Design a protein around this nucleic acid. Sequence first.
RNA 1: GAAAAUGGAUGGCGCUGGAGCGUCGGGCCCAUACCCGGCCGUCGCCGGCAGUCGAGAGUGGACGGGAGCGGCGGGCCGGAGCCCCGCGGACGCUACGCCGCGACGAGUAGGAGGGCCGCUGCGGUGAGCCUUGAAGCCUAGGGCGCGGGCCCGGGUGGAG
RNA 2: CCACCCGACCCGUCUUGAAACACGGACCAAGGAGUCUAACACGUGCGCGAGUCGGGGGCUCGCACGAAAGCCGCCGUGGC
RNA 3: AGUUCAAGAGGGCGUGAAACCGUUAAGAGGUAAACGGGUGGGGUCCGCGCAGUCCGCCCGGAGGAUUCAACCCGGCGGCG
Lengths: 147, 125, 112, 187, 128
Amino acid sequence: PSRLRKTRKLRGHVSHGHGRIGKHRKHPGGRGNAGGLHHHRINFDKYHPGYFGKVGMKHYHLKRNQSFCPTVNLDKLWTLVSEQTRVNAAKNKTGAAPIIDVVRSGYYKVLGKGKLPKQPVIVKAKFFSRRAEEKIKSVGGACVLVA
Amino acid sequence: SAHLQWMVVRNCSSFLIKRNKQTYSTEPNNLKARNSFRYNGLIHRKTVGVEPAADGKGVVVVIKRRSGQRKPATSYVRTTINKNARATLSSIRHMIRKNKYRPDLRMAAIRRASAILRSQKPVMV
Amino acid sequence: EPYIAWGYPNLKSVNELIYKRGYGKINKKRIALTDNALIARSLGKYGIICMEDLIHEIYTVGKRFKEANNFLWPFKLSSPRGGMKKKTTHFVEGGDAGNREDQINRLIRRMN
Amino acid sequence: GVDIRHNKDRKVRRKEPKSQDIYLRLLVKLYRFLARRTNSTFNQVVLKRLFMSRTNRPPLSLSRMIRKMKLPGRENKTAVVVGTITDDVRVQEVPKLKVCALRVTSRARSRILRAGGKILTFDQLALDSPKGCGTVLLSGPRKGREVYRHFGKAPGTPHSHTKPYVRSKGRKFERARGRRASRGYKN
Amino acid sequence: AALRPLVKPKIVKKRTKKFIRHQSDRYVKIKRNWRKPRGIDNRVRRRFKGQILMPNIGYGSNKKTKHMLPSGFRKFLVHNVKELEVLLMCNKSYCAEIAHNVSSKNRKAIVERAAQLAIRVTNPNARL
RNA sequence: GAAAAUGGAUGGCGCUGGAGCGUCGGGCCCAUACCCGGCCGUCGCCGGCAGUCGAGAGUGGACGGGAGCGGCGGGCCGGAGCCCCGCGGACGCUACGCCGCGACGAGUAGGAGGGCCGCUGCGGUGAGCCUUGAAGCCUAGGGCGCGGGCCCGGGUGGAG
RNA sequence: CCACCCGACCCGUCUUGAAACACGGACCAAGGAGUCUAACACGUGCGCGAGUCGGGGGCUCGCACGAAAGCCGCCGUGGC
RNA sequence: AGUUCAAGAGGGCGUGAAACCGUUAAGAGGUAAACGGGUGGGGUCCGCGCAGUCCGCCCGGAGGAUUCAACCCGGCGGCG
Ligand SMILES: [K+]
Ligand SMILES: [K+]
Ligand SMILES: [K+]
Ligand SMILES: [K+]
Ligand SMILES: [Mg+2]
Ligand SMILES: [Mg+2]
Ligand SMILES: [Mg+2]
Ligand SMILES: [Mg+2]
Ligand SMILES: [Mg+2]
Ligand SMILES: [Mg+2]
Ligand SMILES: [Mg+2]
Ligand SMILES: [Mg+2]
Ligand SMILES: [Mg+2]
Ligand SMILES: [Mg+2]
Ligand SMILES: [Mg+2]
Ligand SMILES: [Mg+2]
Ligand SMILES: [Mg+2]
Ligand SMILES: [Mg+2]
Ligand SMILES: [Mg+2]
Ligand SMILES: [Mg+2]
Ligand SMILES: [Mg+2]
Ligand SMILES: [Mg+2]
Ligand SMILES: [Mg+2]
Ligand SMILES: [Mg+2]
Ligand SMILES: [Mg+2]
Ligand SMILES: [Mg+2]
Ligand SMILES: [Mg+2]
Ligand SMILES: [Mg+2]
Ligand SMILES: [Mg+2]
Ligand SMILES: [Mg+2]
Ligand SMILES: [Mg+2]
Ligand SMILES: [Mg+2]
Ligand SMILES: [Mg+2]
Ligand SMILES: [Mg+2]
Ligand SMILES: [Mg+2]
Ligand SMILES: [Mg+2]
Ligand SMILES: [Mg+2]
Ligand SMILES: [Mg+2]
């Protein structure tokens, strides 16, 4: 909407908000990221520490599919199954525990943030964190590895 | 509700007239024709409308029924009062004050009938 | 000292200033002291409930002078009728700035 | 003339909602009157918050409001948030709660009601608690927005844990000179 | 006699002359319509004595008499009889003006209807 | 003592019982400053109004007993209606509205707000206007608005 | 339209400083200069909310409007 | 003179602006003109003013009537 812009309010003001002294010239200071190590050094050093230089090992032909490993924490682990499954297990007469397959839910590794409800559960994952496995053991569950 | 519908049409209505630093509402059943929540003749459950009779004698007082808000055909009751000015004003005053039907519009309806009757008097040059 | 002319007001000057030009700072507003209720509702807790209490508190420099004096809006006086002598120098040099002691009353009469 | 400065004369505060929501403006009409005609400072806070922008009315999670309602002496009180109540899937048991909010998400609404709770809108709250008596006024986390990570001391200054603006995150992005002693320096 | 207003307050105009654009006399390309002078040296903008006056809000008219015609009424442009009806309940403060493009046939109907409703018309004899 | 180039400058005319120089008095003159008042806008007031509530009504006063006083029922034993001779009583509150009080008002570069300022086209709407005369244009015509601008009269024009 | 008294130098611009012996401008009409695209930031409005989003595709006996609109859900692949 | 509604459309002809010019009328004119404020004079035109408050209630005179209150019969509406 052009009718709401400053341009409409600047009609009749001569320099159009750009100053009488400094004016609006073409590219005072260079184009793009010019002068990053020279006249624009302070800006670059202040807002972009780390911009210049090389760090680390370079890897040709990175295939991000290979490192694909989505993670799910413990606190949201029970959301992977229906609420019916959780309650039926808690009031189950025998110590039968539901089996939660995080690979089916689209996760490969189980991390251990948060706490679990006090009921046994069989968790199947490609990878388990140390704390994640500890907390599953504490509530009486088991960690099962899959490939 | 009345307050909800007012927020819809307070500035966007086919009856709205904005001109010469003035605002008028052309909707029927609006005494004063003012764009106002109070005098609006469409949004309220109870509205009073005074307009001249079809023939140039008397006034017709329009009363919205409490029932049938969503049924416009049967929603309004039209009564023709054709008598002298003092009797006509009294009948309207009783229709408003005695029935406790929109008592905020008593003098508005009386003044509107008073102005309509005066218009129906022959004009002398 | 260059920017002010000051001195010691007598009882009459305190009376005329507060009666003619006395305004009270009530709720950050400049309100003329037309009624005693305005004073009492603000300075009542200090025992000042009338213009006479306010004048007495100001004149004798009582224990609530600061609250009573801060209650008074600054006096907006007129230009001195009869003119100034010399605003740019001190009173003892024939001018007007500084401490003129009891002669401030003459200036108050011409400015109030 | 008068020796005063006028740069602070106009106070920048919101006296009406920027929104054109008619339902919200009806609530403002209701709470303008309640704030004016009652001495309840609860009404004055609710009216003030009804004006505020969305960023100044952050959502309140189900977990945080449950935690803030379990504090001692807050049983049977009604939780009031001028904003949205969102469901927190990290919480397992929803206790019976009486809540008043502008918005409640569908799953948060379902869980509160299945627990036996009662959800109120601000018009209903005005009827039940005209002066806001027995209310727990709660706010969502105002600085929970990701923009506050970038606010503060500039990232290139000492002891500045400010998140920089990077088009991508990785080894080649702002991890060299000025980020480690082995490349120039580190702040 | 003409219809009279409900009240006839003394109308005070802070200024009767219009505000002419600076240097609109010296040139024909410069119409008198006011423009704020924004030149760096402009003596009108700098408010030197004896120069073109610049419009400011201090010239604003009393709100009780603003828009009030010298007859004491306030104008209301109308295009037909139906638009004339809205002035029925305020005919002591608001007068009607017929739009410039209404035909002489329609104009006679508006004028006579305004006579019945005691609505003053500012342009009654037009196209007659 | 003391001299510079067009003719010339206590500002000029002039002024010598001063219209000069120094010290002084009274009075008088006027800035957009100060005081008082009017109007405009801005800003502030945790500002007021949903009570249109001509019986409302609005510090906390009622109720039920036991005991009573002050007035109203000594031939001491003594406790009624709200309405009604009148059937009625202005305006208001586009709540984005209306109302009150106080202080304030310079401005380049620049920022922001409002614009019922203005142009062109689109969706709606005005049972809008128009060959009984549209647009445009002209005008010692009449007005409104601080202003941007606008409305109307007359003339010309001919289809929007 | 004219008269008179007081006031009153020519605008734009660059400039510490413009009435300048600084530059542009004889006059009038019409045209004439912060735009659009992508990206990013913050602020504000709206929807939904630990999610959110079909933008690419498909379905609806394509087609005045309609090149619109509606729908998908084992089209959410994917982005964030 | 004629055609045409129109030549106040006459063949680069719809409308016909401004600059600039001619003529007519009015005013003025030795400090270039022009300009702000204030008044005055003249002119143009407007109100068309040129006998110029109406509205409400009450009193008095002088008329006319589909005649008022109340009550009855229908119909409708509001509230419970
Ligand atoms: K700028
Ligand atoms: K220049
Ligand atoms: K030049
Ligand atoms: K001529
Ligand atoms: Mg500027
Ligand atoms: Mg420039
Ligand atoms: Mg620059
Ligand atoms: Mg004097
Ligand atoms: Mg000095
Ligand atoms: Mg000032
Ligand atoms: Mg300033
Ligand atoms: Mg601040
Ligand atoms: Mg004017
Ligand atoms: Mg000109
Ligand atoms: Mg300058
Ligand atoms: Mg200004
Ligand atoms: Mg000289
Ligand atoms: Mg200013
Ligand atoms: Mg519409
Ligand atoms: Mg007029
Ligand atoms: Mg230089
Ligand atoms: Mg200059
Ligand atoms: Mg020179
Ligand atoms: Mg140059
Ligand atoms: Mg040149
Ligand atoms: Mg142009
Ligand atoms: Mg946003
Ligand atoms: Mg979706
Ligand atoms: Mg098409
Ligand atoms: Mg489609
Ligand atoms: Mg997703
Ligand atoms: Mg996926
Ligand atoms: Mg013709
Ligand atoms: Mg002919
Ligand atoms: Mg012609
Ligand atoms: Mg022609
Ligand atoms: Mg031609
Ligand atoms: Mg002049």
